[PDB]
Amino acid sequence: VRMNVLADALKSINNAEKRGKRQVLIRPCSKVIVRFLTVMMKHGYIGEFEIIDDHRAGKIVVNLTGRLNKCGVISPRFDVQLKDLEKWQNNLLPSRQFGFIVLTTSAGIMDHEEARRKHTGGKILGFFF
Amino acid sequence: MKMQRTIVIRRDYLHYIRKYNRFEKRHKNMSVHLSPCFRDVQIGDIVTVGECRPLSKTVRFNVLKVTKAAGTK
Amino acid sequence: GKCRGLRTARKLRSHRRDQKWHDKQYKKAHLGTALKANPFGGASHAKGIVLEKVGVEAKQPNSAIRKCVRVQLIKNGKKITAFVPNDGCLNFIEENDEVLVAGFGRKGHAVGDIPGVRFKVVKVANVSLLALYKGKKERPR
Amino acid sequence: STQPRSKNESKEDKRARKQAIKEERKERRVEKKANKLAFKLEKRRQEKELLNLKKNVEGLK
Amino acid sequence: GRMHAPGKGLSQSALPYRRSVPTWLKLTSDDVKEQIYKLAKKGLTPSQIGVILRDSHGVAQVRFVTGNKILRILKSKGLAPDLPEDLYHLIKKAVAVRKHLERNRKDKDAKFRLILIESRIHRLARYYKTKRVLPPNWKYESSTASALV
RNA sequence: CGGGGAAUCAGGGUUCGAUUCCGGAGAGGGAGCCUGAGAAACGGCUACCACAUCCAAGGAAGGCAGCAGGCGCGCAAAUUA
RNA sequence: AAAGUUGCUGCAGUUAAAAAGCUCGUAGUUGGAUCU
RNA sequence: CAAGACGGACCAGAGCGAAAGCAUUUGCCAAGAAUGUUUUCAUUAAUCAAGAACGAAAGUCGGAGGUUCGAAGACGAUCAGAUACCGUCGUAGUUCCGACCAUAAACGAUGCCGACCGGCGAUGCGGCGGCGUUAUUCCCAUGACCCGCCGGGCAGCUUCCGG
RNA sequence: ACGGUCGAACUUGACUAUCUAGAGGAAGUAAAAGUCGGGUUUCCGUAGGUGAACCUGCGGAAGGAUCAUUAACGG
């Protein structure tokens, strides 16, 4: 059965980028997924998106630009301390220069670079570059 | 609850293994003295206990207050 | 494939330990059957008494007679075939003599040519074979 | 027993003949199991006596 | 993918986007409730009632019209059965299968099916104990199967 | 014996920790004591088992897993300063 | 350490060593959106 | 005239069954998928150590039955050395009933549930929309074909998706 | 000195574990040139055939080299 919708979303967009498609239909939508995609947009990795409100769990249609290389999820959501964050961006991210690890903190779903600023660490979610 | 004036509780906690970054569900049973003022206590409900001077061979703790089960009215 | 849960530690570690026994090295090291059957018995060297000179026939394509020495160890009493190294070093070793034996190099494999021989003679009556061959010391008896 | 079963044979005649073959096979697989343990016990002791030569009593002098 | 079946169906209902009551339907919620009551006294499951309202009266979804679903109305008034509807059906099915088995001994397939049915019953029972619909002491039994139906 | 730790190592880990610091335990084996604030103490006593010295044949004296040193053991370890 | 040849990070299971005959199922693990 | 046996040809890359497997007619008995559903319940689920059903053939007990075939075995042929091959006969078995047994190259030599990633029309099942042709031009619906579309199937062809 | 208690230890058998003497048995090992002398594709599981192999019976597999034909079906 469908465990962890975010993962599904990320795979779906990812495949649709390797294929070089223009738009992706991802379902179901979640608030976590929407926040993730917003974050991704904020760094110019995706473009804008529409949340089709079906009265169930909604669907999202995301505009794609060839700017994204790999959009991955890490499950389980490991607890990442601010001490141990350096080890993750050494393992997951392809360079020190670019790429982002998305993690959920009490302060909100954000990047690792913003986490560092706000001093808060949290549970890891995904990563994109 | 099958002993005279004493109940058996269990504490569930998650023990961390550094190698795997994971946890394991571990439990420890306690023999704990129940005062007859807390009557009509059912099984499967949350009980706050306090450490006391050793009362039996295994009983060291003593029930301080009982809060009922989630489903039970 | 792998269970990748967060509460799965006990499943993981237990599985790892269970599978660890199928490794040839680990089992050899930890089961304690190889440590008990080993004539040296967790020893770098042993010292024995020579019983007889044995000319071990070499394993197929290399055709020779490898000169070995049948020691009986002091510390337990196991019998060993032990290869005497350089040429004419068999002549130094005489029957009923103290001999320091060591491994060959491969931790219990028969090394190269010689079949079923795991050990080499290092010293004869407290002087080294390396010295006796090079003519540096004399052997007492 | 190698007798062809004729049509006129009835109960007690057929039933005793079948029970005789059942007893032959029961005597046979006991005899086969006995040989299976006899060869297994003789192979295992000859395996030791051949592996004994590998360690000691094989050389020249 | 089904629970016990190997098959992967997609036969299901899909409600429309509009949640508001259609303009043609000139029935009050009270009237609908009354109708339901007068159907329930004939001896029907909620499902059956729903079907009836769909086919003949043109009531699409009762939870849109009244606000409450059928079984809540039945529960609220007090004409609802003791054991849950589906579970009861399952039990009945099991009983039937047992009867068949006792008629004819050699049916392995039937036995297998009965086992599956029993499993389902157990599952449902568990669920209904978790949600405190059934009493906690309640248990499905082999001999005390036909007594419940 | 357990820790503190050590060796190796990108990150993760794997192995070692009899060894000079803390804690534990035993003084050939077990058991029981006296004195003392503190010991079931052994460079205290009392037994029995296992060892083992001097004996005038009656008895007496033992306890180096303290520092030297010896034997034995072993692949394996220092001076009776 | 080399050994991503014990693999959590990070291995494999068509033919190379390997997926149970099949199904149910108690524990365990894992569980859809949805509330500023 | 009787006896047991077996259900061909139709028999397909057709179906059904969890798998093993499953084919003469009719009646009875209970199940089951898929489909249709503006029906109900509202997370009840996924996979599963312990445990529990079923599990080809062979074999094993207990009864019944023995048509064909047939391990065994007996003859017959065949040669420096033949003792497997071939022929005739032929026991257990193969058949049914009640117990056991629990293994097969039990094969897709490919865990299960879920998401995504090209295309194509043939088929089977159910459903939806259709001009027509057919039941001696049918009198209305219904059957049989034909063109599409949908969902789940067993398959196939093609593709420098990627491996 | 009675009794109590802690209680080393001894004796008696049972289950065991080890250490070390051993008539004989069956072997194996160097010495004796000592005396005589054609069939099969590859398998799987089971039962029988003198143990195994191999062969056969029964039920499976391919992990075994698809040529050709296949438009009407109406007076």
PDB file of N, CA and C (backbone and C1' of nucleotides) in Angstrom, chain E residues 1-2 8-11 13-14 47 50 54 60-61 69 71 85 93 100 106 111-113 115 123 127 131, chain H residues 17-18 29 31-46 53-54 97-98 114 151-152:
ATOM      1  N   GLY E   1      -5.702  -3.944  -4.903  1.00  0.00           N
ATOM      2  CA  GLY E   1      -5.527  -5.350  -4.430  1.00  0.00           C
ATOM      3  C   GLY E   1      -6.407  -5.686  -3.232  1.00  0.00           C
ATOM      4  N   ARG E   2      -7.242  -6.716  -3.399  1.00  0.00           N
ATOM      5  CA  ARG E   2      -8.167  -7.215  -2.369  1.00  0.00           C
ATOM      6  C   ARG E   2      -7.423  -7.880  -1.210  1.00  0.00           C
ATOM      7  N   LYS E   8      -7.047  -7.614  -8.575  1.00  0.00           N
ATOM      8  CA  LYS E   8      -6.888  -6.193  -8.282  1.00  0.00           C
ATOM      9  C   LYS E   8      -7.966  -5.365  -8.994  1.00  0.00           C
ATOM     10  N   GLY E   9      -9.168  -5.320  -8.416  1.00  0.00           N
ATOM     11  CA  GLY E   9     -10.303  -4.600  -9.013  1.00  0.00           C
ATOM     12  C   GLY E   9     -10.234  -3.081  -8.932  1.00  0.00           C
ATOM     13  N   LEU E  10     -11.202  -2.418  -9.564  1.00  0.00           N
ATOM     14  CA  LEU E  10     -11.366  -0.959  -9.477  1.00  0.00           C
ATOM     15  C   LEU E  10     -12.850  -0.543  -9.460  1.00  0.00           C
ATOM     16  N   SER E  11     -13.727  -1.545  -9.474  1.00  0.00           N
ATOM     17  CA  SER E  11     -15.174  -1.364  -9.347  1.00  0.00           C
ATOM     18  C   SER E  11     -15.513  -0.702  -8.009  1.00  0.00           C
ATOM     19  N   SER E  13     -17.754   3.154  -6.352  1.00  0.00           N
ATOM     20  CA  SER E  13     -18.531   4.364  -6.569  1.00  0.00           C
ATOM     21  C   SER E  13     -17.678   5.623  -6.455  1.00  0.00           C
ATOM     22  N   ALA E  14     -18.086   6.673  -7.161  1.00  0.00           N
ATOM     23  CA  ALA E  14     -17.422   7.971  -7.083  1.00  0.00           C
ATOM     24  C   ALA E  14     -18.451   9.073  -6.971  1.00  0.00           C
ATOM     25  N   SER E  47     -27.332  -0.335   4.211  1.00  0.00           N
ATOM     26  CA  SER E  47     -26.972  -0.406   2.805  1.00  0.00           C
ATOM     27  C   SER E  47     -28.215  -0.493   1.923  1.00  0.00           C
ATOM     28  N   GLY E  50     -30.184   2.667   1.877  1.00  0.00           N
ATOM     29  CA  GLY E  50     -29.488   3.616   1.012  1.00  0.00           C
ATOM     30  C   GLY E  50     -29.846   3.369  -0.445  1.00  0.00           C
ATOM     31  N   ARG E  54     -31.815   5.720  -3.123  1.00  0.00           N
ATOM     32  CA  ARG E  54     -31.206   6.031  -4.429  1.00  0.00           C
ATOM     33  C   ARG E  54     -32.131   5.744  -5.616  1.00  0.00           C
ATOM     34  N   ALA E  60     -29.793  10.968  -3.370  1.00  0.00           N
ATOM     35  CA  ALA E  60     -28.469  10.567  -3.852  1.00  0.00           C
ATOM     36  C   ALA E  60     -27.562  10.073  -2.727  1.00  0.00           C
ATOM     37  N   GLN E  61     -27.327  10.962  -1.767  1.00  0.00           N
ATOM     38  CA  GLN E  61     -26.572  10.681  -0.556  1.00  0.00           C
ATOM     39  C   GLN E  61     -27.289  11.339   0.608  1.00  0.00           C
ATOM     40  N   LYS E  69     -25.202  10.345   8.431  1.00  0.00           N
ATOM     41  CA  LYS E  69     -25.316   9.087   7.687  1.00  0.00           C
ATOM     42  C   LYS E  69     -26.319   8.101   8.325  1.00  0.00           C
ATOM     43  N   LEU E  71     -26.638   4.986   9.433  1.00  0.00           N
ATOM     44  CA  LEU E  71     -26.391   4.261  10.639  1.00  0.00           C
ATOM     45  C   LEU E  71     -26.337   5.159  11.851  1.00  0.00           C
ATOM     46  N   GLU E  85     -23.449  -4.580  10.780  1.00  0.00           N
ATOM     47  CA  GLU E  85     -24.096  -5.190   9.614  1.00  0.00           C
ATOM     48  C   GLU E  85     -23.202  -6.119   8.809  1.00  0.00           C
ATOM     49  N   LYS E  93     -22.395 -16.079   6.390  1.00  0.00           N
ATOM     50  CA  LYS E  93     -21.672 -16.751   5.309  1.00  0.00           C
ATOM     51  C   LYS E  93     -20.898 -17.950   5.863  1.00  0.00           C
ATOM     52  N   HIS E 100     -22.578 -26.554   4.801  1.00  0.00           N
ATOM     53  CA  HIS E 100     -22.182 -27.243   3.585  1.00  0.00           C
ATOM     54  C   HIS E 100     -21.135 -28.321   3.859  1.00  0.00           C
ATOM     55  N   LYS E 106     -15.699 -33.999   1.978  1.00  0.00           N
ATOM     56  CA  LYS E 106     -14.452 -34.036   1.207  1.00  0.00           C
ATOM     57  C   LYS E 106     -14.009 -32.706   0.572  1.00  0.00           C
ATOM     58  N   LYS E 111     -13.511 -25.734   2.566  1.00  0.00           N
ATOM     59  CA  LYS E 111     -12.841 -25.615   3.857  1.00  0.00           C
ATOM     60  C   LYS E 111     -11.904 -24.405   3.873  1.00  0.00           C
ATOM     61  N   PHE E 112     -11.128 -24.303   2.797  1.00  0.00           N
ATOM     62  CA  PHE E 112     -10.175 -23.222   2.609  1.00  0.00           C
ATOM     63  C   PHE E 112     -10.900 -21.862   2.656  1.00  0.00           C
ATOM     64  N   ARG E 113     -12.009 -21.814   1.925  1.00  0.00           N
ATOM     65  CA  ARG E 113     -12.802 -20.607   1.832  1.00  0.00           C
ATOM     66  C   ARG E 113     -13.324 -20.208   3.209  1.00  0.00           C
ATOM     67  N   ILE E 115     -12.024 -20.983   6.089  1.00  0.00           N
ATOM     68  CA  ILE E 115     -10.883 -20.481   6.853  1.00  0.00           C
ATOM     69  C   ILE E 115     -10.667 -18.975   6.631  1.00  0.00           C
ATOM     70  N   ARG E 123     -10.734 -10.464  12.057  1.00  0.00           N
ATOM     71  CA  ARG E 123     -10.197  -9.139  11.771  1.00  0.00           C
ATOM     72  C   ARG E 123     -11.215  -8.069  12.144  1.00  0.00           C
ATOM     73  N   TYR E 127     -11.282  -5.114  15.104  1.00  0.00           N
ATOM     74  CA  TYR E 127     -11.537  -3.718  14.792  1.00  0.00           C
ATOM     75  C   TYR E 127     -12.644  -3.162  15.671  1.00  0.00           C
ATOM     76  N   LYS E 131     -12.682  -0.164  18.545  1.00  0.00           N
ATOM     77  CA  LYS E 131     -13.599   0.968  18.521  1.00  0.00           C
ATOM     78  C   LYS E 131     -14.779   0.865  19.495  1.00  0.00           C
TER      79      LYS E 131
ATOM     80  P     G H  17     -10.850 -17.516 -10.388  1.00  0.00           P
ATOM     81  O5'   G H  17     -10.106 -18.671  -9.582  1.00  0.00           O
ATOM     82  C5'   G H  17     -10.862 -19.543  -8.724  1.00  0.00           C
ATOM     83  C4'   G H  17     -10.054 -20.756  -8.344  1.00  0.00           C
ATOM     84  C3'   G H  17      -8.727 -20.492  -7.662  1.00  0.00           C
ATOM     85  O3'   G H  17      -8.881 -20.020  -6.330  1.00  0.00           O
ATOM     86  C1'   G H  17      -8.442 -22.190  -9.276  1.00  0.00           C
ATOM     87  P     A H  18      -8.373 -18.538  -5.948  1.00  0.00           P
ATOM     88  O5'   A H  18      -6.810 -18.738  -5.757  1.00  0.00           O
ATOM     89  C5'   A H  18      -5.993 -17.672  -5.251  1.00  0.00           C
ATOM     90  C4'   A H  18      -4.661 -18.227  -4.820  1.00  0.00           C
ATOM     91  C3'   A H  18      -4.143 -19.388  -5.665  1.00  0.00           C
ATOM     92  O3'   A H  18      -3.335 -18.889  -6.722  1.00  0.00           O
ATOM     93  C1'   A H  18      -4.093 -19.979  -3.376  1.00  0.00           C
ATOM     94  P     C H  29     -29.969 -26.089  -4.258  1.00  0.00           P
ATOM     95  O5'   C H  29     -28.626 -26.362  -3.445  1.00  0.00           O
ATOM     96  C5'   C H  29     -28.632 -27.125  -2.220  1.00  0.00           C
ATOM     97  C4'   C H  29     -27.217 -27.426  -1.780  1.00  0.00           C
ATOM     98  C3'   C H  29     -26.315 -26.224  -1.560  1.00  0.00           C
ATOM     99  O3'   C H  29     -26.667 -25.456  -0.412  1.00  0.00           O
ATOM    100  C1'   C H  29     -25.110 -27.898  -2.719  1.00  0.00           C
ATOM    101  P     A H  31     -22.898 -19.179   0.258  1.00  0.00           P
ATOM    102  O5'   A H  31     -21.410 -18.628   0.313  1.00  0.00           O
ATOM    103  C5'   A H  31     -20.703 -18.460  -0.905  1.00  0.00           C
ATOM    104  C4'   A H  31     -19.369 -19.155  -0.859  1.00  0.00           C
ATOM    105  C3'   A H  31     -18.301 -18.384  -1.624  1.00  0.00           C
ATOM    106  O3'   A H  31     -17.682 -17.431  -0.770  1.00  0.00           O
ATOM    107  C1'   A H  31     -18.453 -20.558  -2.517  1.00  0.00           C
ATOM    108  P     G H  32     -17.690 -15.878  -1.182  1.00  0.00           P
ATOM    109  O5'   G H  32     -16.833 -15.879  -2.527  1.00  0.00           O
ATOM    110  C5'   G H  32     -15.506 -16.441  -2.539  1.00  0.00           C
ATOM    111  C4'   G H  32     -14.884 -16.326  -3.907  1.00  0.00           C
ATOM    112  C3'   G H  32     -15.153 -15.041  -4.665  1.00  0.00           C
ATOM    113  O3'   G H  32     -14.384 -13.945  -4.195  1.00  0.00           O
ATOM    114  C1'   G H  32     -15.430 -16.867  -6.121  1.00  0.00           C
ATOM    115  P     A H  33     -14.871 -12.452  -4.493  1.00  0.00           P
ATOM    116  O5'   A H  33     -14.106 -12.090  -5.843  1.00  0.00           O
ATOM    117  C5'   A H  33     -12.678 -12.246  -5.935  1.00  0.00           C
ATOM    118  C4'   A H  33     -12.237 -12.325  -7.376  1.00  0.00           C
ATOM    119  C3'   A H  33     -12.512 -11.086  -8.215  1.00  0.00           C
ATOM    120  O3'   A H  33     -11.516 -10.079  -8.022  1.00  0.00           O
ATOM    121  C1'   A H  33     -13.216 -13.014  -9.397  1.00  0.00           C
ATOM    122  P     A H  34     -11.946  -8.524  -7.900  1.00  0.00           P
ATOM    123  O5'   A H  34     -12.360  -8.151  -9.394  1.00  0.00           O
ATOM    124  C5'   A H  34     -11.422  -8.288 -10.485  1.00  0.00           C
ATOM    125  C4'   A H  34     -12.144  -8.301 -11.811  1.00  0.00           C
ATOM    126  C3'   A H  34     -13.119  -7.157 -12.048  1.00  0.00           C
ATOM    127  O3'   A H  34     -12.487  -5.943 -12.411  1.00  0.00           O
ATOM    128  C1'   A H  34     -14.166  -9.181 -12.640  1.00  0.00           C
ATOM    129  P     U H  35     -12.948  -4.599 -11.705  1.00  0.00           P
ATOM    130  O5'   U H  35     -14.267  -4.209 -12.501  1.00  0.00           O
ATOM    131  C5'   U H  35     -14.264  -4.092 -13.933  1.00  0.00           C
ATOM    132  C4'   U H  35     -15.637  -4.391 -14.501  1.00  0.00           C
ATOM    133  C3'   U H  35     -16.735  -3.420 -14.113  1.00  0.00           C
ATOM    134  O3'   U H  35     -16.681  -2.272 -14.948  1.00  0.00           O
ATOM    135  C1'   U H  35     -17.525  -5.637 -13.883  1.00  0.00           C
ATOM    136  P     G H  36     -16.701  -0.808 -14.301  1.00  0.00           P
ATOM    137  O5'   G H  36     -18.230  -0.627 -13.895  1.00  0.00           O
ATOM    138  C5'   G H  36     -19.258  -0.717 -14.896  1.00  0.00           C
ATOM    139  C4'   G H  36     -20.627  -0.594 -14.278  1.00  0.00           C
ATOM    140  C3'   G H  36     -20.759   0.400 -13.142  1.00  0.00           C
ATOM    141  O3'   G H  36     -20.983   1.706 -13.651  1.00  0.00           O
ATOM    142  C1'   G H  36     -21.861  -1.623 -12.586  1.00  0.00           C
ATOM    143  P     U H  37     -20.373   2.971 -12.877  1.00  0.00           P
ATOM    144  O5'   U H  37     -21.116   2.950 -11.466  1.00  0.00           O
ATOM    145  C5'   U H  37     -22.505   3.276 -11.409  1.00  0.00           C
ATOM    146  C4'   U H  37     -23.114   2.884 -10.093  1.00  0.00           C
ATOM    147  C3'   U H  37     -22.565   3.533  -8.848  1.00  0.00           C
ATOM    148  O3'   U H  37     -22.944   4.907  -8.809  1.00  0.00           O
ATOM    149  C1'   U H  37     -23.175   1.279  -8.415  1.00  0.00           C
ATOM    150  P     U H  38     -21.904   6.067  -9.242  1.00  0.00           P
ATOM    151  O5'   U H  38     -22.378   7.306  -8.363  1.00  0.00           O
ATOM    152  C5'   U H  38     -21.868   7.464  -7.033  1.00  0.00           C
ATOM    153  C4'   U H  38     -22.902   8.088  -6.133  1.00  0.00           C
ATOM    154  C3'   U H  38     -24.251   7.377  -6.028  1.00  0.00           C
ATOM    155  O3'   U H  38     -24.475   6.943  -4.690  1.00  0.00           O
ATOM    156  C1'   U H  38     -24.526   9.734  -6.385  1.00  0.00           C
ATOM    157  P     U H  39     -23.824   5.574  -4.158  1.00  0.00           P
ATOM    158  O5'   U H  39     -25.088   4.735  -3.684  1.00  0.00           O
ATOM    159  C5'   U H  39     -25.864   5.179  -2.559  1.00  0.00           C
ATOM    160  C4'   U H  39     -26.032   4.061  -1.563  1.00  0.00           C
ATOM    161  C3'   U H  39     -25.066   4.086  -0.398  1.00  0.00           C
ATOM    162  O3'   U H  39     -25.615   4.924   0.608  1.00  0.00           O
ATOM    163  C1'   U H  39     -25.204   1.887  -1.279  1.00  0.00           C
ATOM    164  P     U H  40     -24.652   5.738   1.592  1.00  0.00           P
ATOM    165  O5'   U H  40     -24.250   4.652   2.684  1.00  0.00           O
ATOM    166  C5'   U H  40     -25.240   4.032   3.524  1.00  0.00           C
ATOM    167  C4'   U H  40     -24.630   2.852   4.239  1.00  0.00           C
ATOM    168  C3'   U H  40     -23.383   3.175   5.043  1.00  0.00           C
ATOM    169  O3'   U H  40     -23.768   3.627   6.333  1.00  0.00           O
ATOM    170  C1'   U H  40     -23.008   1.241   3.736  1.00  0.00           C
ATOM    171  P     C H  41     -22.881   4.711   7.085  1.00  0.00           P
ATOM    172  O5'   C H  41     -21.630   3.857   7.586  1.00  0.00           O
ATOM    173  C5'   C H  41     -21.805   2.839   8.588  1.00  0.00           C
ATOM    174  C4'   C H  41     -20.597   1.938   8.674  1.00  0.00           C
ATOM    175  C3'   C H  41     -19.268   2.611   8.974  1.00  0.00           C
ATOM    176  O3'   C H  41     -19.172   2.913  10.367  1.00  0.00           O
ATOM    177  C1'   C H  41     -18.986   0.964   7.289  1.00  0.00           C
ATOM    178  P     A H  42     -18.899   4.430  10.864  1.00  0.00           P
ATOM    179  O5'   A H  42     -17.366   4.661  10.481  1.00  0.00           O
ATOM    180  C5'   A H  42     -16.333   3.762  10.952  1.00  0.00           C
ATOM    181  C4'   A H  42     -15.136   3.782  10.025  1.00  0.00           C
ATOM    182  C3'   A H  42     -14.216   4.993  10.167  1.00  0.00           C
ATOM    183  O3'   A H  42     -12.862   4.563  10.169  1.00  0.00           O
ATOM    184  C1'   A H  42     -14.978   4.830   7.931  1.00  0.00           C
ATOM    185  P     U H  43     -11.939   4.895  11.421  1.00  0.00           P
ATOM    186  O5'   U H  43     -10.560   4.196  11.044  1.00  0.00           O
ATOM    187  C5'   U H  43     -10.321   2.827  11.400  1.00  0.00           C
ATOM    188  C4'   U H  43      -9.346   2.198  10.436  1.00  0.00           C
ATOM    189  C3'   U H  43      -7.900   2.677  10.546  1.00  0.00           C
ATOM    190  O3'   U H  43      -6.981   1.583  10.509  1.00  0.00           O
ATOM    191  C1'   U H  43      -8.682   2.978   8.338  1.00  0.00           C
ATOM    192  P     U H  44      -6.629   0.783  11.855  1.00  0.00           P
ATOM    193  O5'   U H  44      -7.643  -0.451  11.811  1.00  0.00           O
ATOM    194  C5'   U H  44      -7.561  -1.455  10.773  1.00  0.00           C
ATOM    195  C4'   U H  44      -8.900  -2.105  10.516  1.00  0.00           C
ATOM    196  C3'   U H  44      -8.976  -2.922   9.239  1.00  0.00           C
ATOM    197  O3'   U H  44      -8.499  -4.221   9.548  1.00  0.00           O
ATOM    198  C1'   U H  44     -10.974  -1.640   9.571  1.00  0.00           C
ATOM    199  P     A H  45      -7.927  -5.156   8.395  1.00  0.00           P
ATOM    200  O5'   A H  45      -7.183  -4.129   7.437  1.00  0.00           O
ATOM    201  C5'   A H  45      -7.451  -4.095   6.031  1.00  0.00           C
ATOM    202  C4'   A H  45      -6.388  -3.287   5.342  1.00  0.00           C
ATOM    203  C3'   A H  45      -5.077  -4.023   5.104  1.00  0.00           C
ATOM    204  O3'   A H  45      -5.106  -4.750   3.893  1.00  0.00           O
ATOM    205  C1'   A H  45      -4.636  -1.914   6.072  1.00  0.00           C
ATOM    206  P     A H  46      -4.240  -6.076   3.774  1.00  0.00           P
ATOM    207  O5'   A H  46      -2.763  -5.528   3.541  1.00  0.00           O
ATOM    208  C5'   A H  46      -2.393  -4.865   2.318  1.00  0.00           C
ATOM    209  C4'   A H  46      -0.903  -4.648   2.283  1.00  0.00           C
ATOM    210  C3'   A H  46      -0.070  -5.856   2.679  1.00  0.00           C
ATOM    211  O3'   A H  46       0.100  -6.712   1.569  1.00  0.00           O
ATOM    212  C1'   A H  46       0.681  -3.984   3.884  1.00  0.00           C
ATOM    213  P     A H  53      -3.354 -27.973  10.644  1.00  0.00           P
ATOM    214  O5'   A H  53      -4.574 -27.534   9.716  1.00  0.00           O
ATOM    215  C5'   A H  53      -4.750 -28.080   8.404  1.00  0.00           C
ATOM    216  C4'   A H  53      -5.577 -27.154   7.540  1.00  0.00           C
ATOM    217  C3'   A H  53      -5.535 -27.515   6.062  1.00  0.00           C
ATOM    218  O3'   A H  53      -6.569 -28.463   5.832  1.00  0.00           O
ATOM    219  C1'   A H  53      -4.979 -25.222   6.325  1.00  0.00           C
ATOM    220  P     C H  54      -6.200 -29.982   5.460  1.00  0.00           P
ATOM    221  O5'   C H  54      -5.673 -29.856   3.957  1.00  0.00           O
ATOM    222  C5'   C H  54      -6.598 -29.653   2.873  1.00  0.00           C
ATOM    223  C4'   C H  54      -6.013 -28.766   1.798  1.00  0.00           C
ATOM    224  C3'   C H  54      -4.956 -29.383   0.906  1.00  0.00           C
ATOM    225  O3'   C H  54      -5.453 -30.321  -0.029  1.00  0.00           O
ATOM    226  C1'   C H  54      -4.285 -27.213   1.480  1.00  0.00           C
ATOM    227  P     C H  97     -12.786 -41.689  -3.861  1.00  0.00           P
ATOM    228  O5'   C H  97     -13.043 -42.473  -2.498  1.00  0.00           O
ATOM    229  C5'   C H  97     -14.383 -42.788  -2.068  1.00  0.00           C
ATOM    230  C4'   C H  97     -14.369 -43.721  -0.880  1.00  0.00           C
ATOM    231  C3'   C H  97     -13.604 -43.255   0.348  1.00  0.00           C
ATOM    232  O3'   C H  97     -14.253 -42.229   1.087  1.00  0.00           O
ATOM    233  C1'   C H  97     -13.135 -45.534  -0.047  1.00  0.00           C
ATOM    234  P     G H  98     -13.403 -40.975   1.622  1.00  0.00           P
ATOM    235  O5'   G H  98     -12.688 -41.562   2.919  1.00  0.00           O
ATOM    236  C5'   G H  98     -13.446 -41.913   4.097  1.00  0.00           C
ATOM    237  C4'   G H  98     -12.546 -42.507   5.156  1.00  0.00           C
ATOM    238  C3'   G H  98     -11.281 -41.725   5.468  1.00  0.00           C
ATOM    239  O3'   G H  98     -11.531 -40.635   6.346  1.00  0.00           O
ATOM    240  C1'   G H  98     -10.754 -44.019   5.239  1.00  0.00           C
ATOM    241  P     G H 114      -1.072  -3.786  -5.093  1.00  0.00           P
ATOM    242  O5'   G H 114      -0.242  -2.443  -4.846  1.00  0.00           O
ATOM    243  C5'   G H 114      -0.774  -1.405  -4.002  1.00  0.00           C
ATOM    244  C4'   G H 114       0.207  -0.275  -3.812  1.00  0.00           C
ATOM    245  C3'   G H 114       0.623   0.507  -5.041  1.00  0.00           C
ATOM    246  O3'   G H 114      -0.410   1.270  -5.654  1.00  0.00           O
ATOM    247  C1'   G H 114       2.491   0.218  -3.637  1.00  0.00           C
ATOM    248  P     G H 151      -9.422   2.569 -18.503  1.00  0.00           P
ATOM    249  O5'   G H 151      -9.626   1.430 -17.412  1.00  0.00           O
ATOM    250  C5'   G H 151     -10.177   1.729 -16.113  1.00  0.00           C
ATOM    251  C4'   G H 151     -10.702   0.469 -15.478  1.00  0.00           C
ATOM    252  C3'   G H 151      -9.724  -0.689 -15.455  1.00  0.00           C
ATOM    253  O3'   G H 151      -8.809  -0.510 -14.387  1.00  0.00           O
ATOM    254  C1'   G H 151     -11.839  -1.466 -16.163  1.00  0.00           C
ATOM    255  P     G H 152      -7.305  -1.012 -14.531  1.00  0.00           P
ATOM    256  O5'   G H 152      -7.449  -2.591 -14.390  1.00  0.00           O
ATOM    257  C5'   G H 152      -7.769  -3.150 -13.113  1.00  0.00           C
ATOM    258  C4'   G H 152      -8.299  -4.549 -13.242  1.00  0.00           C
ATOM    259  C3'   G H 152      -7.365  -5.580 -13.829  1.00  0.00           C
ATOM    260  O3'   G H 152      -6.281  -5.896 -12.970  1.00  0.00           O
ATOM    261  C1'   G H 152      -9.577  -5.968 -14.566  1.00  0.00           C
TER     262        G H 152
END
